[PDB]
Amino acid sequence: ATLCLGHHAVPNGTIVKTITNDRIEVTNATELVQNSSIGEICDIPHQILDGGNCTLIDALLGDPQCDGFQNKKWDLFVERSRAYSNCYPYDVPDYASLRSLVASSGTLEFKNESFNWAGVTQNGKSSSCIRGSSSSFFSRLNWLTHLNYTYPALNVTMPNKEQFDKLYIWGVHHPDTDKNQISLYAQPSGRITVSTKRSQQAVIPNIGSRPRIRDIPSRISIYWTIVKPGDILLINSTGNLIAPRGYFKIRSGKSSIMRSDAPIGKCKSECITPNGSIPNDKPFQNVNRITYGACPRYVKQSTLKLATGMRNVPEGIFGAIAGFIENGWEGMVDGWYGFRHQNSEGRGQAADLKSTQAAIDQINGKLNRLIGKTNEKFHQIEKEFSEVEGRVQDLEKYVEDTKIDLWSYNAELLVALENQHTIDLTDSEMNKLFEKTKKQLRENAEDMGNGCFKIYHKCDNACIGSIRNETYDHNVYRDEALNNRFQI
Amino acid sequence: ATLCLGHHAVPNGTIVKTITNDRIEVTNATELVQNSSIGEICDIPHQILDGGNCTLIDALLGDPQCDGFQNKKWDLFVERSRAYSNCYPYDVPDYASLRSLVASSGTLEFKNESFNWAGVTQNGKSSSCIRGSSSSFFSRLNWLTHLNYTYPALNVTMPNKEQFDKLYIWGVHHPDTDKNQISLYAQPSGRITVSTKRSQQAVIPNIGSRPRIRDIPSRISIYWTIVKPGDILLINSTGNLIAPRGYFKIRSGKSSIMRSDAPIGKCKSECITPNGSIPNDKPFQNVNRITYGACPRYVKQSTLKLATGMRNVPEGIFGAIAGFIENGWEGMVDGWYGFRHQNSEGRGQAADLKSTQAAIDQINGKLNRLIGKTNEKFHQIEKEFSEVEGRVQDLEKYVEDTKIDLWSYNAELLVALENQHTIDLTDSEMNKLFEKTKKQLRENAEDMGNGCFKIYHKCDNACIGSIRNETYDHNVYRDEALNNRFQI
Amino acid sequence: ATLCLGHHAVPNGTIVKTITNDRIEVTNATELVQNSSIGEICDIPHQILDGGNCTLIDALLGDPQCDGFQNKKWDLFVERSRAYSNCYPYDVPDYASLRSLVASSGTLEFKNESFNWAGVTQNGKSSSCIRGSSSSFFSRLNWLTHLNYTYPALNVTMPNKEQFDKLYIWGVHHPDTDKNQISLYAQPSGRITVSTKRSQQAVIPNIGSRPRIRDIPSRISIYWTIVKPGDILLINSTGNLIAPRGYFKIRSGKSSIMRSDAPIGKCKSECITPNGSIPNDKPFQNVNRITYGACPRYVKQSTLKLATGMRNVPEGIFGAIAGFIENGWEGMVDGWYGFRHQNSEGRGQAADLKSTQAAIDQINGKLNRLIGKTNEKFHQIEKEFSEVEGRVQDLEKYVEDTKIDLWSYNAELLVALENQHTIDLTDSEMNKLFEKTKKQLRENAEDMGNGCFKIYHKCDNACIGSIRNETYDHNVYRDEALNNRFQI
Ligand SMILES: CC(=O)N[C@H]1[C@H](O[C@H]2[C@@H](O)[C@@H](CO)O[C@@H](O[C@H]3[C@H](O)[C@@H](O)[C@H](O)O[C@@H]3CO)[C@@H]2O)O[C@H](CO)[C@@H](O[C@@H]2O[C@H](CO[C@]3(C(=O)O)C[C@H](O)[C@@H](NC(C)=O)[C@H]([C@H](O)[C@H](O)CO)O3)[C@H](O)[C@H](O)[C@H]2O)[C@@H]1O
Ligand SMILES: CC(=O)N[C@H]1[C@H](O[C@H]2[C@@H](O)[C@@H](CO)O[C@@H](O[C@H]3[C@H](O)[C@@H](O)[C@H](O)O[C@@H]3CO)[C@@H]2O)O[C@H](CO)[C@@H](O[C@@H]2O[C@H](CO[C@]3(C(=O)O)C[C@H](O)[C@@H](NC(C)=O)[C@H]([C@H](O)[C@H](O)CO)O3)[C@H](O)[C@H](O)[C@H]2O)[C@@H]1O
Ligand SMILES: CC(=O)N[C@H]1[C@H](O[C@H]2[C@@H](O)[C@@H](CO)O[C@@H](O[C@H]3[C@H](O)[C@@H](O)[C@H](O)O[C@@H]3CO)[C@@H]2O)O[C@H](CO)[C@@H](O[C@@H]2O[C@H](CO[C@]3(C(=O)O)C[C@H](O)[C@@H](NC(C)=O)[C@H]([C@H](O)[C@H](O)CO)O3)[C@H](O)[C@H](O)[C@H]2O)[C@@H]1O
Ligand SMILES: *[C@@H]1O[C@H](CO)[C@@H](O[C@@H]2O[C@H](CO)[C@@H](O)[C@H](O)[C@H]2NC(C)=O)[C@H](O)[C@H]1NC(C)=O
Ligand SMILES: *[C@@H]1O[C@H](CO)[C@@H](O[C@@H]2O[C@H](CO)[C@@H](O)[C@H](O)[C@H]2NC(C)=O)[C@H](O)[C@H]1NC(C)=O
Ligand SMILES: *[C@@H]1O[C@H](CO)[C@@H](O[C@@H]2O[C@H](CO)[C@@H](O)[C@H](O)[C@H]2NC(C)=O)[C@H](O)[C@H]1NC(C)=O
Ligand SMILES: *[C@@H]1O[C@H](CO)[C@@H](O[C@@H]2O[C@H](CO)[C@@H](O)[C@H](O)[C@H]2NC(C)=O)[C@H](O)[C@H]1NC(C)=O
Ligand SMILES: *[C@@H]1O[C@H](CO)[C@@H](O[C@@H]2O[C@H](CO)[C@@H](O)[C@H](O)[C@H]2NC(C)=O)[C@H](O)[C@H]1NC(C)=O
Ligand SMILES: *[C@@H]1O[C@H](CO)[C@@H](O[C@@H]2O[C@H](CO)[C@@H](O)[C@H](O)[C@H]2NC(C)=O)[C@H](O)[C@H]1NC(C)=O
Ligand SMILES: *[C@@H]1O[C@H](CO)[C@@H](O)[C@H](O)[C@H]1NC(C)=O
Ligand SMILES: *[C@@H]1O[C@H](CO)[C@@H](O)[C@H](O)[C@H]1NC(C)=O
Ligand SMILES: *[C@@H]1O[C@H](CO)[C@@H](O)[C@H](O)[C@H]1NC(C)=O
Ligand SMILES: *[C@@H]1O[C@H](CO)[C@@H](O)[C@H](O)[C@H]1NC(C)=O
Ligand SMILES: *[C@@H]1O[C@H](CO)[C@@H](O)[C@H](O)[C@H]1NC(C)=O
Ligand SMILES: *[C@@H]1O[C@H](CO)[C@@H](O)[C@H](O)[C@H]1NC(C)=O
């Protein structure tokens, strides 16, 4: 009889990378880089708020377009690129910081407070800000002006008797002219001091024409202040104050904001990107560096294939597969390793289950460490910028670029080591089954060197089966075998 | 005779992770993550300065509570969370930067300088700042006011004739009212310009009530300026100047500051955390991301076990351990690998020293690369924040979170590769001792397949010993062995 | 006959590090850390602009020294440490940001625009700024002052009808005295508002003596503003305006700036450092963390040797090299593995080509992954600082230090894993050639255990050659061999 040890092969293998080889074919691999989105943001499990035409900041101030956003909450606020401001023209010094802190607070919940604006007109309006047919203003702000050509210095307080922090949004009006300055606040100067036991902010208006927006050459600047529990807001002004009508709760949670034009859909997905949700089964993704939720890590590579089978040899350090075994057996489809024999009763093929299962368990082990293991991230840094800003933006970008190169490196190295190891462990399993069989045969057979043993005795099907199920008793055939082997 | 090769096992193994296995038992492991502190800051080798009730900044300005800190130096300044300000109410725009640069300078050494404050009253005092029973002020600052209802414009210089940089601390007073403005500085305006050949800073006071602190509704703002050698300080003011009384040396060294409530103790420890000192023998730690000194790197994992022994098989790619050798020998306690025999004189067990020492040396090699190898870090970035700040704080936190995920990744991968390698190299040593023995026996013995040889000749204790010490001469027994082996 | 399998050795090996060994000798290694520069900046392929005596900013404003830089472009602008300002004394709030954004724009291209400066004197001059024998000014700036003791409020526009962004550089003059204030701008106040539909910047001068520079106690502050296509610049001022004479194009490309005192040379090199160009064949470098172009990654290690040959054993997990083969063959110089024999015709040595080529191909595979693979980087963050700045600088440095430790870690681990693997794969190749030969010999030879076979039949040179070329037919000699082997 002849008993040959072998392993399977497939007609259609896959190319992977190892430590030593850019391009080597295995029987099977799996992709570790997610490269597509379904192109929609799934609305489960994260609570999504579609900004539509409104920026977060405009929803905050109460631009008329944004009245539907009053007191809303979100896990992720989605800002659309078509969003536009449609109220009094304003800027926010350190706009990105205000956006950021509201985003991660995750709420626009507002509470009215009663201020003693003694001696001034309230509820200033503008046709740059139309609410319902008429001149209006930011819903959360209170434009104060002269009453009877008098603007009597303001000096109001508001203790924080609450358990939580209050966020106050206020402003300063910059009139285009000294004339408008006078006719608005009956006063040439105009000064604002807003303070607490912990902080002070002081602002003087800057008079001058700015280019007209909805016919307004004047401008408002927006500021904010956080009042801790037991502290006190004190607003001391003699003109130009755009006053708050109350406070926002400021919370600390996992909320964020993302710029995206992707539609919201009724589906479930843990990981969100501007492009849409992406599955998070893979450890890496190449869809977008901007992400929210439990997401694969962003890498530069568009693909990284993890070998999930042995080297494919159609028809490693252990020397068996692609070694002393000339090639794989495509006809073996019920196992990874097995036996072909020829004896007096014919020629046959049988899978070896234990060795097949050993290789598969090791590979499944690798997969369990790498698949469905992603990390959860929420409010991050900004990663795209529409305007040159210099030093801080240079650092923001450098930090992300650094991080991405390091992860891309981790990904490349991980797959190469794992693949080299997969090829070696599968080669080893082959070598181990061969060795175990050789030992079973003792003096009754000889290694032909091509993975085949010549067995020097009659070995019928039951005899072959006794080898494969490891009950073969070499003593039974020894006399016969030694006589055939050692003749002249 | 029968000669069996084997390896040890222990009743109580340890679970470790490898590339292929989340949970596999070895004979021994070591922990690579430091997870506890002694709960005290050891006062050797770093020179520790306990801030007690004083912030660094208050020690800098000379709050009365902090007189004991005059001219002190430190490697690490420890700020306590109970610290509180107890002098005139002040703020420092960019407070964190001033704190940071004094911290890393490591000295409060001060040098008096004589300024020509011609025509003003000096040494302004407040009951918000009590020194010894009476109204006082920041020791390092000089509150100037009117003399005889005159405040004559100040214009003073101070060349830096020194070899080193000078740090000047100064301020501007913000009176609550135009009345107090007048009664203090006999002047409505008030302006400050402090300049050098290299820089200029200009400040106007902002009049208005802030909430009262120790009954003061006024406030001081603190500023600083660094004067290079050969440069000149020029202070040009017509009111509101809180003047310097001299300069601080500004040094560049390894000094830092840390917020901690841990007590200082008389002991020695290279690595300090807010929780207390931690040993630095391990390469990683999970105690605190804030550290000072030669410290293990912070990771998320609470434990990472490095295998320091073979797979434990009570009673790998090489197929010997947990392979053709059915199990380990718990009765073998003087070696890792060895021999059990049965011959005419009895049954015995002996360790093999060379193979045991080969496995141990390799493992010790790994340990020497990983143990006691920690990296020294001093003044870092801040890693905890008591207040929402936006953009820069978002970047500070993102940088640390990024770094920590990358190191945690490094740690996880390192231990898995090392453990897989440890299991393989110990399996290999087993396989190598088996092969070497088989070769010694030549034609005189046969491999039974379970790590045991059947020796076909009388092999007494000396004979067994000749095998183990590698002096066995197969020629001596060949005739006898061939006759027993190849009979019918 | 005797047939011995062996491998080469060299008299002069190299020490490398592995996972288990700090110091182990191989036949050959290669250096992975570039540690030297040619000490010159090569002027191909990057377009280099030598700043000589001029900072970028001075070339931007048009300091007289810098007239040769008008409208120049660059890939890399090189600033020399001897550079000095020689015009009116000025500062730029956020200087580093302006430098940065011009650097990466890569152009000083300027376009004259005609402003309507109605009612003022133009072309203000100073002896602090000498052009051609006479008092001059920044070429790109326009110092406006009173005309006939009148300074009539300015209010000019300039639409951006272009397709691209415009960068405007402007300033505010700070006179030393209220007197000079009057005599310059016929006005006590002085205010500047520069605005667009997107932004507003407002500046008031700060009067006061600063220390004299080229006899000027006054100072200019420089500001900038970017005007998007379809937007409008509006400059509204009543004094102190240092006006623009036009705009710079602001581009987005790969341009940067570097501080260096290295001379420019006529040579070609992809990677530039302040020290000079460095070859980029190696994956790592220790020359400078500041780099431009396709550059090896900066690491702390001064050397990292990658094994490119087997363990050197003069005269691993597979047990062959430095194992059952007592030592290497220094006399074998045409191959890595081979055969020595003694037969009736003499004693000889022959290389085995297939096994030699297998080891070499694997090693070349590793090298191809690591050599000539460097990554291209352009404008980065700053990495050296001449002045204490606090929080942002602390983050800039912390980010770079973090990155460098992570890459140094990657480098150390990479070389140790690769070297351990190289030693194992070369040991394996040895073991594989031995096994294949043993199998060829079948029952005709015995393993002596030291890598040598005793062949039990007459085996002349052709016979030896049949073994080495794998045509040996064991059946031919079997009878003879069995008779010699199994005699009494
Ligand atoms: C406060 C104000 O309304 N300013 C007006 C301005 O008003 C002048 C005009 O009424 C004349 C004739 O009566 O009188 C001047 O004042 C005299 C006053 O009668 C007298 O009592 C005093 O003693 O002496 C002075 C002499 O100076 C007034 O200065 O007139 C111009 C031209 O009509 C207005 O500009 C136009 O504004 C348009 C936008 O209008 C609003 C808006 O935003 O919708 C109307 C808003 O109700 C008003 N909101 C508030 C709270 O006031 C705002 C607000 O003033 C601005 O937005 C701030 O910039 O303006 C549009 O811009 C058009 O292009 C302008 O020509 C100016 O608003
Ligand atoms: C500079 C000053 O002392 N301001 C006082 C203020 O003084 C007024 C009062 O003396 C009246 C009666 O004489 O006269 C006013 O001035 C007139 C002046 O006599 C006359 O010559 C001139 O021609 O015309 C004016 C008319 O206006 C003075 O304005 O009085 C109030 C009420 O007493 C004081 O407020 C109280 O201050 C308390 C804190 O006191 C200190 C402190 O900090 O401890 C005392 C310090 O010595 C003083 N330090 C210095 C260098 O001045 C400081 C300092 O002024 C403030 O800290 C700055 O804010 O105040 C406490 O706050 C209490 O709640 C207040 O009612 C005010 O200090
Ligand atoms: C604008 C100016 O030139 N300021 C001069 C200043 O001029 C005074 C002087 O002319 C006297 C005598 O005629 O008159 C004063 O004005 C009177 C005026 O005649 C009258 O019509 C009005 O009604 O009443 C006033 C009464 O005050 C003038 O104030 O004189 C001083 C001393 O000479 C000058 O300081 C010296 O400047 C030197 C540097 O000179 C330049 C320069 O930078 O090179 C000359 C430049 O041409 C000038 N550039 C422009 C656009 O003006 C600049 C510029 O003023 C400064 O740089 C801004 O600081 O100065 C040098 O610094 C020397 O150390 C000074 O003593 C002052 O420049
Ligand atoms: C400063 O100049 C601008 C013109 O460049 C003035 O604003 C323009 O005024 C006209 C009619 O009054 C408007 O129809 C334009 O829309 C305005 N232009 C822009 C783009 O804002 C401005 O009024 C001038 N300043 C003063 C106070 O005289
Ligand atoms: C802060 O508020 C108080 C008003 O309560 C201001 O002081 C008053 O201002 C009025 C009108 O300008 C003066 O005529 C009074 O003499 C002041 N009253 C008192 C009690 O002093 C003060 O101007 C405000 N300050 C700011 C920053 O606007
Ligand atoms: C502005 O308002 C506050 C009151 O809200 C004034 O400060 C208070 O004054 C009383 C008595 O004068 C003190 O006992 C309180 O401690 C003060 N309150 C706080 C929390 O600061 C302030 O004086 C007013 N401003 C002016 C100048 O009129
Ligand atoms: C800087 O210092 C000088 C004083 O040495 C100031 O100029 C003087 O100010 C006085 C009093 O206000 C005037 O009456 C004199 O005419 C000025 N003397 C000279 C020599 O010019 C100047 O005001 C100070 N500037 C600042 C920023 O406070
Ligand atoms: C404020 O003081 C400085 C002197 O410390 C004055 O500037 C000096 O003036 C002399 C002669 O006028 C010059 O030769 C020096 O070079 C100046 N010193 C420096 C270092 O700037 C300044 O003029 C004074 N201010 C005023 C307006 O009186
Ligand atoms: C912006 O420009 C306009 C000038 O076009 C300024 O307003 C004029 O200023 C003059 C001179 O000071 C006044 O006498 C006129 O009454 C104003 N003209 C108009 C049409 O209002 C305004 O001062 C400038 N503002 C700034 C910021 O300098
Ligand atoms: C996703 O969005 C980014 C940003 O626009 C884009 O560059 C990327 O190609 C998109 N990718 C996919 C797979 O949709
Ligand atoms: C958003 O604005 C556009 C154009 O101004 C308008 O046509 C559309 O109806 C608005 N959409 C929403 C979400 O109301
Ligand atoms: C150390 O301090 C940090 C910060 O408070 C805390 O979260 C951590 O659990 C503490 N750990 C130990 C081991 O003392
Ligand atoms: C710190 O302040 C507390 C409470 O104000 C006081 O009881 C204690 O004595 C002070 N401790 C020191 C270190 O002086
Ligand atoms: C290169 O420049 C840096 C910065 O001065 C210096 O520290 C380094 O040693 C220099 N190295 C070489 C190899 O020229
Ligand atoms: C640069 O300035 C120095 C010293 O001021 C001068 O000698 C030299 O000629 C200048 N060099 C150039 C590049 O013009």
List all residues of chain B from 304 to 333 with a beta carbon under 8 Å from chain A. Answer: 317-319, 323-324
Report how far ligand 15's centroid is from the alpha carbon of C82 (Å).
9
Residue A145 Cα distances to A118, A124, A139, A150, A206, angstroms? 11, 7, 17, 9, 17
**Number of CB pairs < 8 Å for B and C?**
121
Residue type, B443: E
- Which chain A positions have a beta carbon within 8 Å of B448's beta carbon? 439
Q: How many helices (H) and strands (E) does chain A have?
A: 7, 36
Q: How far apart are CA A130 and CA A149, in angstroms?
A: 26
- Tell me the technique behind this structure: X-ray
Give the span between the Cα atoms of C113 and C109, in whole angstroms: 13
Distances (CA, A) of C178 to B185, C175, C186, C194, C209: 19, 7, 10, 24, 11
Tell if the CB–CB gap between B392 and A392 is shorter than 8 Å: yes
Nearest to A103 by CA among C148, B388, B348: B388
Q: How many CA atoms lie within 13 A of A237 on its CB side?
A: 35
Q: Is B213 on the interface with A (CB under 8 A)?
A: yes
DSSP string, A340-397: EEEETTEEEEEEEHHHHHHHHHHHHHHHHHHSS-PEEE-S------SS---HHHHHHH
CB within 8 Å of A56: residues ≥ 6 apart:
A77, A79, A99, A102, A103, A257
Any chain A CB within 8 A of the CB of C187?
Answer: no
Strand partners, B340: B4, B349
| C-alpha B422 chain-centroid distance | 28
For residue A176, the CA-to-ligand 12 centroid distance in Å is: 55
Q: Is A291 helix (H, G, I), strand (E, B) or coil?
A: coil
Sheet holding C154-159, edge to edge: C154-159, C232-237, C192-195, C200-203
Structure tokens at A313: 């040899």
Which SS3 state, helix, strand or coil, does residue A71 take?
Answer: coil
Assess contact for C430 and B417: CB atoms under 8 A: no
* Pairwise CB contact (< 8 Å): A195 & B206: no
The residue type at B278? I
Residue A189 at interface with chain B, using a CB cutoff of 8 Å: no
Closest CA to A380 of A282, A273, A485, A221: A273
Question: A–B: how many Cβ contacts below 8 A?
Answer: 121
Q: Is C35 in the pocket of ligand 9 (CB under 6 A)?
A: no
Max CA pair span of chain C: 133
Q: Which among B184, B185, B224, B183 is positioned nearest to B201, based on CA atoms?
A: B224
Nearest chain A alpha carbon to B394? A381
Pairing of strands C219-227, C90-91: parallel
How many residues are present in chain A?
A: 488
List all chains that touch chain C, counting a touch as 3 or more CB pairs closer than 8 Å. Answer: A, B
Find the ligand nearest to A151 CA: 5
Dist CA A288 CA A279 (whole Å): 13
Closest CA to A2 of A474, A475, A453: A453
Break-preceding residues in chain A (C–N over 2.5 Å):
315
Ligand 15, CB within 6 Å, residue ranges: C 52-53
Report chain A residues whose CB lies below 8 A from the CB of C431: 319
Helix (H) or strand (E) holding B100, with range, is helix B95-105
Alpha-carbon dihedral sign for residues B464, B470, B475, B478: positive
Does A215 touch chain C if contact means CB atoms closer than 8 Å?
no
Atom 14, ligand 11: residue with shortest CA distance: A53
CB A107 within 8 A of CB A249: yes
Neighbours of C248 (CB within 10 A): 23
Measured by CA distance, the residue closest to atom 28 of ligand 4 is C155
Q: Determine how many CB atoms are found less than 10 A away from the CB of residue B260.
A: 23
> Rounded to an integer, what distance in angstroms lies between the CA atom of residue B56 and that of residue B50?
10
Q: Give the C-alpha separation, C137 to A127, whole Å.
A: 46
Instruction: Round to whole Å and give the CA distance between C294 and C279.
Output: 10
Q: Which two tokens stand for residue A173?
A: 């009006």
Place of tokens 């490119």: C308
Long-range contacts of A385-392 (CB under 8 A, 24+ apart): A387/C226, A388/C101, A388/C226, A388/C250, A389/C97, A390/C94, A390/C96, A390/C97, A390/C98, A390/C100, A390/C101, A391/C94, A391/C96, A391/C97, A391/C100, A391/C392, A392/B391, A392/B392, A392/B395, A392/C392
- Strands ordered across the beta sheet of A76-79: A48-50, A76-79, A256-259
Q: Return the CA Rg of chain C.
A: 37
CA-wise closest residue to A140 among A226, A71, A210: A71
Of A21, A208, A323, the CB nearest to C236: A208
Residue nearest to atom 48 of ligand 3 (CA): C126
Query: How buried is residue C104: exposed, middle or buried, by Cβ count under 10 Å (0-12/13-18/19+)?
Result: buried
The reply to whether ligand 1 has any atom less than 6 angstroms from the CB of A179 is: yes
- C121: which 2 tokens? 């004197």
Nearest to C287 by CA among C311, C323, C262: C262
Amino acid identity for residue B384 in this structure: E
Residue of C nearest to B437 (CA): C449
Q: Residues C180-186: contacts with CB within 8 Å, 24+ apart?
A: C180/C218, C181/C205, C181/C207, C183/C146, C184/C145, C184/C146, C184/C239, C184/C240, C185/C145, C185/C146, C185/C151, C185/C238, C185/C239, C185/C240, C186/C146, C186/C149, C186/C150, C186/C151, C186/C239
Amino acid at A374: T
Pairing of strands C41-44, C241-244: unpaired
* Span from the CA of A156 to the centroid of ligand 5 (angstroms): 11
Ligand 15 center to residue C213 CA distance, Å?
19
Q: At what angle do helices B391-441 and B353-370 cross, to 10 degrees?
A: 170
Go through B119-155 and write b for each residue having 16 or more CB atoms within 10 A of its CB, e for each that does not. ebeeebebebbbbeeeebbbbbbbbbbbeeeebeebe
B103 to chain C: which residues are within 8 Å by CB? none
Domain regions of chain C by residue span: 2-34+303-485, 47-258
C462 interface with A at CB cutoff 8 Å:
no
Using CB distances shorter than 6 Å, the residues near ligand 7 are B 153, 155, 191, 193, 236-238; C 177, 207-209
DSSP assignment letter at B321: B
Count of CB atoms situated within 10 Å of the CB of C372: 12
Which of A19, A95, A104, A195 is the best residue to mutate to test the B interface, defined by the most B CB atoms within 10 Å of its own CB?
Answer: A195
Distance CA A258, CA A377 (A): 13
Q: Which helix (H) or strand (E) is B477 found in, with range?
A: helix B474-485
C446 contacts on B by Cβ (under 8 Å):
442-443
Helix B391-441 to helix A95-105 angle (10° resolution) is 60
Ligand 4 centroid to residue A209 C-alpha, Å:
7
Interface check C426 vs B, CB under 8 A: no
Q: Give residue C41 CA to ligand 14 midpoint distance, Å.
A: 14
User: Measured between CA atoms, how close is A265 to chain B, in angstroms?
Assistant: 30
Locus of tokens 């979100």? A74
Q: Is residue C222 a contact partner of residue C92, using CB atoms and an 8 Å limit?
A: yes
- Which segments of A84-152 does DSSP mark as H helices, in order? 95-105
CA C298 to CA C301: how far, in whole Å? 9
Strands B219-227 and B76-79, bridge-based pairing: unpaired
C-alpha C210 – ligand 8 centre gap (Å): 8
How would you classify the pairing of strands C246-249 and C219-227? unpaired
Q: Does residue B296 have a cis peptide bond before it, meaning omega lies within 30 degrees of 0?
A: no
Return the CATH architecture of domain C47-258. Answer: Alpha-Beta Complex (3.90)
Identify the residue whose C-alpha is closest to ligand 15 atom 6. Answer: C53
Does residue B271 contact residue B294 with C-beta atoms inside 8 Å? yes
Contact with chain B for residue A373, Cβ under 8 A: no
Ligand 4 center from residue C122 Cα (angstroms) = 24
Q: Residue C439 and residue A449: Cβ atoms within 8 Å?
A: yes
Q: Distance (Å) from the C-alpha of residue A223 to the closest C-alpha of chain C?
A: 15
Would residue A71 be called left, alpha or beta, if left means φ above 0 and alpha means ψ between -120 and 50 degrees? Answer: left
- A391-441 and B391-441 are packed helices; what angle lies between their axes, rounded to 10 degrees? 20
Q: Is A471 on the interface with B (CB under 8 A)?
A: no
Quickly tell me which residue has 């040899």 as its tokens: A313
What tokens appear for B14 in the block?
A: 């340890």
Rounded distance between C-alpha atoms, residue A458 and residue A445, angstroms: 11
How many residues can be counted in chain C?
488
Q: How many CA atoms lie within 13 A of A409 on its CB side?
A: 24
CATH architecture for the domain at C2-34+303-485: Alpha-Beta Complex (3.90)
Chain B contact for A424 (CB, 8 A cutoff): yes
Which atom of ligand 12 is closest in space to residue B286's alpha carbon?
13
Of the candidates A317, A306, A263, A264, which has an alpha carbon nearest to the alpha carbon of residue A283? A306
